[PDB]
Design a binder for this molecule. Sequence first.
Ligand SMILES: CCOC(=O)CCC(=O)O
Ligand SMILES: CCOC(=O)CCC(=O)O
Lengths: 128, 129
Amino acid sequence: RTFSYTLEDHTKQAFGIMNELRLSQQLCDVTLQVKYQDAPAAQFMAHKVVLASSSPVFKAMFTNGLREQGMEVVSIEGIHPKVMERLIEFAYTASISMGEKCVLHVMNGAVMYQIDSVVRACADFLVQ
Amino acid sequence: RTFSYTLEDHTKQAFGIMNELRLSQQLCDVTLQVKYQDAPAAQFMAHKVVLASSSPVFKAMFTNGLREQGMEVVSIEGIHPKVMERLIEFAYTASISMGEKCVLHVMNGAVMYQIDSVVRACADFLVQQ
Ligand SMILES: CCOC(=O)CCC(=O)O
Ligand SMILES: CCOC(=O)CCC(=O)O
């Protein structure tokens, strides 16, 4: 015979533990340093493979050229720290929540990293 | 006003991409050397984050002390490569499949790494016969 099993919500469970390690700042290999004009400088630790799984730009960024081993600090301009936070939070939880006055900004940052999922979601809200 | 959104199958999508990165050996930070008895040696590269998310044992051994961040080679003992390769494939696909005269072996390695999900499924197959 042959025996097969599939834990249905495993990915949801496994991703929740991935977010835990991200808040616990454990097993991280990248540090996003965001700098926007007239904005406090931010700093976001994350896992390269997790961001690469949610954005083709993060994936192409971390798999091309000479990459730092252990911990790679990546400088980032053109996106506000608050927007870079919601993007990471979506990648780690598959959920994104902002105010009415920031959907356009989040949508723009979503396009900058080709997170197509929250691009279309921001579109449905703006033109409701 | 507020806006909320939830990609329900996102976690399945991102895990599929993470399985590709494993099969392409890109961004991997651990290499598991599995030599069981006299079986032919085998190596499995993976991401410590993914393994820590599916196994509390892998999480404990990757998030304690000072690990040489870069590419850690870890020797695995007491488990057969065919079973190990399947536990890794479960961690990246959430699906496991093996033979009948075999459920005992992957249940042991699953118990060895505290993957309760597939431990109960194997136990519920031995009882049901
Ligand atoms: C330019 C900063 O404005 C924002 O986009 C704030 C982001 C947010 O509150 O979700
Ligand atoms: C000793 C290795 O045990 C196995 O993994 C058996 C594999 C199988 O029969 O499907």
